[PDB]
């Protein structure tokens, strides 16, 4: 017989849709900083980072779902009557042009994937393939990007998965509107190699493995005690 190990599998263990980032962007602003952005990383949410770092090399597709909700703000503008709000979620592949302004040329997205979503419909969804000149993402890198520089330890350009950019296509009304994107992340077709011990010490930095040393477990009163 034997009990089923179906949901213990790496696919079921890791292919779980979780929120990894949320940002708010305005509809009007002083500068062009009316856009949200997120460099796609797996080392910013502790639960997902621990689950992925239980293995050494992984290879998966990124399924991203965006939950965009808009809120009208304060007051002092009357007769708002805003039409429906359209959002653009532009994905910038590795090595692609990166916007610095809400109306940058990169938003014209000649080759950057972009999804335009009107509010009230189902949340937008896009899937990023395995994008790496290497053969697998490496959660751990015991080496230097440049051996000359000490600060390049553990950094390799093979784990860069691109950047997501979010903005308002139309303002709708002359009054303030702030939208939250709430990106939901879900690996698909996951293959993992070289399993590793779970991270014991709490994480400190996203780009580091540094740790304050911690006890192996919780203490008890006596070696023969039971409670």
């Amino acid at each position: 017989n034997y009990h089923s190990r179906s949901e213990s599998t790496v696919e079921n263990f890791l292919c779980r849709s979780a929120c990894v980032f949320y940002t708010t962007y305005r509809n009007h602003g002083t500068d062009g900083d009316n856009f949200g952005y997120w460099v796609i990383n797996t080392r910013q949410v502790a639960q997902l980072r621990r689950k992925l770092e239980m293995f050494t090399y992984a290879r998966f597709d990124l399924e991203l779902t965006f939950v965009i909700t808009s809120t009208q703000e304060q007051s002092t503008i009357q007769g708002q009557d805003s039409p429906v709000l359209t959002h653009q979620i532009m994905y910038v592949p590795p090595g692609g042009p990166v916007p610095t302004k809400v109306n940058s040329y990169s938003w014209q997205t000649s080759t950057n994937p972009s999804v335009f979503w009107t509010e009230g419909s189902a949340p937008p969804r896009m899937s990023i393939p395995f994008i790496s000149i290497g053969n697998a993402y490496s959660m751990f890198y015991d080496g230097w990007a440049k051996f000359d520089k000490q600060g390049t330890y553990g950094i390799n350009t093979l784990n860069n998965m691109g950047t997501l950019y979010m903005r308002h296509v139309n303002d709708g009304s002359p009054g303030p509107i702030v939208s939250t994107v709430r990106i939901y992340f879900k690996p698909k077709h996951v293959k993992t190699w070289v399993p590793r011990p779970p991270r014991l010490c709490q994480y400190q930095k996203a780009g580091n493995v540094n740790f304050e040393p911690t006890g192996v477990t919780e203490s008890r009163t006596d070696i023969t005690t039971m409670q």
Binding site: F140, Q150, P198, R199
Partner: protein, 239 residues
């Protein structure tokens, strides 16, 4: 009985009843510019022995850096741009029947180690001294660019007791005295710059402290002998 093994102009001695741990069940092979092999590098490089004492924490070696100055294969790391090799690590331990202690001999692929200072990166010297072993400490390490080499976290922010997930061997002096681990080439790319990437490190952590009867030798020599296997490199052809 006694098994004699000869690679190149090097000969070592091994017991017939010696258990060999083969990596992840994978025997090193070639990737079958055309890659160029070097069988002359397939030698036994016996590192300087480390003295195991009653109060000795573990050691580690990072082997691309460890064999970086070991004659051949060191000249090849310096010479070729791309390189690939599997390794046979054989850890011996010379002790009498009046000596105690247990050792965890584990080879850790991609042992990215943290720093004593959180907002800092360990420097090249702290991570790997080359053929000289780097020692753990029983307490927290202090240093601007030093590795956090506390034994309990194995320098990696994990539990040292959980290190058995990696290809390991237990050296119980009352049972064993040697550890043979055959590590294949493990990487996310077919071949990598060897001078700037330690593919795995060897950790020899005494889980049970060394002990001995009165009059017996205080220290126990631990000898690490490494034999590169199926080493192949970039290749320089066409112009």
């Amino acid at each position: 009985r006694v098994r004699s093994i000869t690679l190149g102009n090097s000969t070592i001695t091994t017991q017939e009843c010696a258990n060999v741990v083969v990596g992840y069940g994978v025997w090193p092979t070639y990737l079958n510019q055309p890659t160029q092999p070097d069988v002359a590098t397939c030698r036994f490089y016996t590192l300087e022995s480390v003295m195991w004492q009653q109060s000795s924490p573990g050691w580690w070696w990072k082997f691309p850096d460890a064999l970086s100055n070991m004659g051949l294969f060191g000249q090849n790391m310096q010479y070729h741009y791309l390189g690939r090799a599997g390794y046979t690590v054989h850890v011996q331990c010379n002790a009498s029947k009046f000596h105690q202690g247990c050792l965890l001999v584990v080879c850790v692929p991609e042992a990215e180690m943290g720093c004593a200072t959180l907002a800092n990166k360990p420097d090249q010297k702290s991570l790997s001294n080359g053929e000289t072993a780097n020692m753990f400490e029983s307490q927290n390490s202090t240093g601007q660019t030093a590795v956090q080499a506390n034994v309990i976290n194995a320098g990696m922010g994990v539990g040292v007791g959980n290190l058995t997930i990696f290809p390991h061997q237990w050296i119980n002096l009352r049972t064993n005295n040697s550890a043979t681990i055959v590590m294949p080439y493990i990487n996310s790319v077919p071949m990598d710059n060897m001078f700037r990437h330690n593919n795995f490190t060897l950790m020899i952590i005494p889980f049970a402290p060394l002990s001995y009867s009165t009059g017996a030798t205080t220290y126990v020599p631990i000898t690490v002998t490494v034999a590169p296997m199926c080493a192949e490199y970039n290749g320089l052809r066409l112009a």
